Design a protein around this nucleic acid. Structure first.
Ligand SMILES: Nc1ncnc2c1ncn2[C@@H]1O[C@H](COP(=O)(O)OP(=O)(O)NP(=O)(O)O)[C@@H](O)[C@H]1O
Ligand SMILES: Nc1ncnc2c1ncn2[C@@H]1O[C@H](COP(=O)(O)OP(=O)(O)NP(=O)(O)O)[C@@H](O)[C@H]1O
Ligand SMILES: [Zn+2]
Ligand SMILES: [Zn+2]
Ligand SMILES: [Zn+2]
Ligand SMILES: [Zn+2]
Lengths: 676, 676
DNA sequence: CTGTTACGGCTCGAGCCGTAACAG
DNA sequence: CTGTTACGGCTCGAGCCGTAACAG
């Protein structure tokens, strides 16, 4: 029917909830980090919709009614193939080659297959159409000397329209290519025989421009792209294809996108929906809520304290609902307050000389030390390059002795003012089931000593290393401390089940005999942080670490959770807590690349508090954030622009946000003037 | 929108046609064999719909608007896996195990995973849940001695409901299982806690019964199934899943199904469509046309003479259209006439003694010789087993000395009355690009001699083998007579393009110099049969073979077409022409397994004429046909029934169709009484 | 001339945890 | 007591075409 009825969903931490999502409408799922929105969407609806279609050619839900095939558009990147480019992915190269073979004037007969690099007819004989000959320097990729990177035969390059061949057309940026195709002149016969192709090309280019990627080049390889750029390219391609009756699931479509493009992105999403589809956008932006037809709010907390549908309905009912977390922040009951007094530089600056990496226009920038510094700018302005490829790499090479090649820069002044450089990202903190937050924070070494300092341990002569599931002697011998066994089937992939010897306790019978304060090591490792905070009140050495973990918002997690199952936000919060627990020497540099990726308003407030605490501790924090709430609390803002692509790479404004708001020709300043 | 607009389609032999298929409606595509309906549907619409969805996770059309994801349900069978059974495919085993774990009374706590054979918890330790231990006899599959084929642990078999465990329930036929579940009694608590599961099981069993497979057992392996049974199982599963907004493409759903189940199949198709889908059924049945909302007719002929949309609209407009081929047969302008005089047996009979293979109830049947004999019966009555597994195999072993194990039968009387056995099926006649209809019919040897009989060939001393693309000396040396070359790409599968040396002519420069009647060998091999009929009028030796090929309806095909690209109908017609060209000795046996699979009414009439010619030639033809038009023209009908499955396997009626129509308790007789 | 049989030949090392030692 | 550094250890052969020879 016209509803996606889900009854009896218990995936992950869902508390047996029932929902009725309307069909063919814009639906936004909102909740705190780890509340369960991501599980409820991806693991249930996307999984069921994909399985029910692939099986034609296993969620813990009871039954779902009215499920169309589901396509997931998330921030995922793959190496792909060298044959794939931006134009190939967007399916505009086919129309380009059709137009070239139809109305192309040469400078056998011209054929559409003659312009393709995926067929032997038009592919360059030397590089086989790849465009680059990868040779291992006595594998460094070098341009093909024959085709000069065009990846086509020399004969096919004679066909030109408007004075430009196919490679020159494909090398232009999307916006200027659309402008060139718009004002092109053709006779009556050419217009009659190439109306459909021109209309399709114009429509696809307009969709790509409206999405936000008006600076990309069609000749750029699809492999070398960011997550946001790839996701936006996929959204534009899906709009162009025009599939009907398909449920689309989006994970934070506004990630890595400036505030000025939000209206265009919302219009693009509405246009995609209007052709007979449904959207399940999982977004936390304030502007996105007001453009939706149905909001589903989970909570009220996270982990074991959430998973229930707190509120449902339109934005007005969400605001009027008192127990909804999202409505409290939307209505203005709780909000982030702009600081009254801002820190000032002490006279120590980091100046980068001759930064010309990628599209940077050989500029010099000064970064204050000891203050919270934010970097803004339009999409594709070169801020990410300028930070990651130059400053972080040079600092790592100078301090940590890391052998990573920096970008195209001359030198940097002020290296002696820092002692170490630390990068915090959503990368997982572990790849094996042998690490948990308890060991990463370092509190496990204290808990082991506390356990070994008991009367029974001294009586039995147990050492500090006995109570650890990583050495021989204390762990379970049957499962080798992993807690699971390997069972192989005849025609099925190997399955993993809990070990029968220890029942998943990870320790042998002898170890479990000891008990401190009525609990053994398994009970300690199988309790949440909010309980270990009260349990370890007497001991301050572990109390400090537990309180630090609780401060970053990890009061719902348990010390025994494997690092493999941790999400990006959990890993980032664990790293932040670990850095908080350390001893600040006043010479530490923290670099964060958009830390607000997938955080609610309350999580943003907590992260702002933690960042201010870290700055006040005596160190310096530099972040690249597009969120105005984080931006307005900064102490020094560097703006890059004034546009994206070849037009950008310069510096528009610098200084405190109050000074930046006074700059007329700056989008960030214009937005800051209104928000303040 | 609400239309699938296709503009500029030129796949295979389509003559650049434009169509506008309505959406969310029952659409039937009708045309002659080889007209282009199959191409237009599968190669264009299914391919585009599948690609546009797979690429998210290349037809010769210009653009298609409004394409939902497409699922194709056709008669294809795969080995699959031993883990897959009928219940697993139909997704009823999950509900069965849920019910057993919920309300099961035993004779850790009971768990749904305990009843599954795909998890180590409930899988039998010996056979690993497969159910059969395949060992190579000094690989014969024998039942597992531990679980006795149940493929489960002995502990889980104690759980019983209604006096039967899970294996006994899964071993019942679908109809009797539905009856058992319908009259089962349970208390108020059991009904309250298992209402949804029971409702789902009853609905799925009812769907399976309505489809037509009320005799299958849930424990039967999905691998050992026929094409029609697998297609019907897939249709029932797709109905059960309940996908919305998906285009469904069906290829003759009424293949291998009795006339009495047509109403149930049509109701099932309408029920599948009514939940918000679209159907593209490609059917030729007369009853199916009257149940359609839109009929698209191709033609007017086949091959190069077809590919254009002759007529469109409802059944009334199709009938009123004069140039439409389908309307002429629907309105009654052209029809098959029942013969007035029928041939009678001459006193030679083939008696099968002790036929007990599969569900045959140890019966004896007499087959007349020298007359056209048809075999009828309900679906799954054992006719196909009785013919293929017993009679054909025994005849092949006795005459062709083929070492194939026959079925469970005692002996056969009348083997000496036959000299050879010939089986005609839709199997391809060749697997390599070295065989074409010209060589298979045998006319190529005559054409080679005709070419070598010319003055120039004698002058140059060319032999008969010079003009053949299969030996060294006459063929092109560069491409070795294949006509295509192999080109390898760096990161792409090898592609094939026409050879540059010979331009696909398959012969060297010297051979092409010779010419007979103004045409060389390439021109002879690149002309249709309808042209070679007039070209070779003078020579009777090749004229007979060409006329024989033309008679079976292959006047649109060319002698140079590779056997790899031939479809099933083309291969069957080629085999029929080859058998016609031979010399009849009066002791030949022809066995056909539903030869009307994918044939129009005109094709059915032509096939009936060819079969009558073959019978009048002095041989005997035995076919297993479900088409009443073919049945009413037979001379001896053997009916098997009176039901399908364990209830069938007997003989209901025998003799001429007039006598069979007098039998009251026979479905075939009841239908023959009305049709005559 | 026509059918049959047999033969010949062709293709299909990296990252993290735990521990010992040293220095503040 | 706390931080750092170094080290040890663990896991991720069949089927078809062409031809020579023989018999009707
Ligand atoms: N490998 C590359 N080859 C060529 N051009 C590149 C490459 N990497 C980046 N660029 C370009 O150089 C600039 C880099 O900008 P960058 O700082 O990565 O973007 P950004 O501002 O962080 N945008 P966003 O991802 O939306 O947050 C852009 O104009 C890119 O198109
Ligand atoms: N391998 C097998 N194992 C067990 N039972 C089988 C097997 N093959 C067939 N059967 C059963 O034995 C009977 C065979 O009937 P069969 O003659 O194959 O069907 P049919 O009349 O041709 N039906 P259809 O496919 O609709 O045309 C049916 O009852 C089958 O369920
Ligand atoms: Zn090249
Ligand atoms: Zn164990
Ligand atoms: Zn067994
Ligand atoms: Zn060649």
């Amino acid at each position: 029917k016209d509803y996606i009825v889900v009854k009896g969903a218990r995936e992950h931490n869902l508390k047996n909830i029932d929902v009725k999502i309307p069909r063919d409408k814009f639906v936004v799922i909102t909740g705190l980090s780890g509340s369960g929105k991501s599980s409820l969407a991806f693991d249930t609806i996307y999984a069921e919709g994909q399985r029910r279609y692939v099986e034609s050619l296993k969620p813990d839900v009871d039954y779902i009614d009215g499920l169309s095939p589901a396509i997931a558009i998330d921030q995922k990147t793959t190496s792909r193939n060298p044959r794939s480019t931006v134009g190939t992915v967007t399916e505009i190269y086919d129309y380009l080659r059709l137009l070239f073979a139809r109305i192309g004037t040469p400078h056998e007969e011209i054929t559409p297959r003659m312009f393709s690099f995926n067929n032997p007819y038009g592919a360059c004989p030397e590089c086989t159409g790849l465009g680059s000959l990868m040779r291992i320097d006595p594998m460094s990729n070098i341009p093909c000397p024959v085709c000069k990177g065009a990846r086509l035969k020399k004969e096919s390059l004679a066909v030109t329209i408007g004075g430009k061949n196919i490679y020159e057309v494909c090398c232009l940026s999307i916006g200027e290519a659309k402008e060139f195709f718009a004002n092109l002149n053709l006779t009556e016969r050419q217009q009659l025989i190439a109306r459909q192709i021109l209309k399709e090309i114009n429509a696809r280019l307009g969709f790509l421009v409206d999405v936000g990627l008006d600076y990309l080049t069609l000749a750029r390889a699809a492999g070398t792209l960011s997550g946001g750029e790839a996701q936006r390219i996929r959204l534009a391609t899906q709009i162009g294809s025009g599939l009907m009756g398909v449920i689309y699931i989006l994970d934070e479509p506004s990630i890595g996108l400036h505030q000025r493009d939000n209206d265009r992105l919302l219009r693009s999403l509405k246009k995609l929906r209007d052709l007979g589809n449904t959207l399940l956008v999982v977004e936390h932006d304030e502007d996105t809520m007001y453009a939706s037809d149905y909001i589903i709010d989970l909570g009220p907390g996270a982990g074991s304290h959430g998973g229930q549908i707190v509120a449902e309905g339109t934005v007005e009912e969400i605001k009027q609902n008192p127990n909804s977390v999202t409505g409290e922040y939307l209505s203005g009951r709780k909000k982030i307050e702009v600081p009254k007094e801002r820190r000032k530089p002490n006279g120590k600056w980091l100046e980068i000389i001759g930064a010309r990496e990628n599209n940077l226009k050989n500029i010099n920038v000064r970064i204050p030390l000891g203050v919270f510094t934010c970097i803004t700018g339009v999409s594709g302005s070169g801020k990410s390059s300028l930070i990651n490829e130059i400053l972080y790499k040079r600092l790592a090479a100078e301090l940590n002795r890391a052998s990573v090649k920096p970008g195209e820069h001359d030198l940097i002044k002020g290296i002696e003012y820092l002692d170490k450089v630390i990068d915090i990202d959503q990368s997982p903190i572990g790849r094996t089931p042998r690490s948990n937050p308890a060991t990463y924070t370092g509190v496990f070494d204290f808990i082991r000593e506390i356990f070994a300092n008991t009367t029974e341990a001294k009586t039995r002569g147990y050492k500090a290393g006995r109570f650890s599931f990583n050495v021989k002697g204390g762990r379970c011998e049957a499962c080798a401390g992993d807690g699971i066994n390997k069972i192989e089937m005849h025609f099925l992939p190997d399955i993993y089940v809990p070990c029968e010897v220890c029942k998943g306790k990870r320790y042998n019978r002898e170890t479990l005999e000891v008990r401190y304060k009525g609990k053994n090591i398994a009970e300690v490792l199988d309790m949440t942080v909010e309980e270990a905070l009260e349990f370890f009140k007497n001991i301050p050495r572990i109390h400090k670490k537990i309180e630090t973990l609780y401060d970053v918002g990890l009061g719902y997690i348990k010390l025994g959770q494997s690092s493999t199952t941790l999400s990006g936000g959990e890993a980032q919060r664990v790293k932040l807590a670990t850095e908080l627990s350390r001893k600040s020497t006043g010479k530490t540099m923290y670099i964060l690349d958009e830390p607000t990726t997938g955080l609610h308003m309350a999580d943003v407030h907590r992260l702002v508090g933690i960042l201010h605490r870290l700055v006040e501790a005596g160190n310096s924090v530099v972040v690249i954030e597009h969120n105005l709430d984080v931006i307005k609390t900064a102490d020094y803002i560097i703006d890059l622009g004034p546009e994206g692509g070849s037009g950008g790479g310069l510096v528009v404004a610098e200084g405190t946000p109050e000074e930046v708001a006074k700059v007329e020709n700056s989008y960030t300043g214009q937005f800051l003037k209104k928000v303040l």
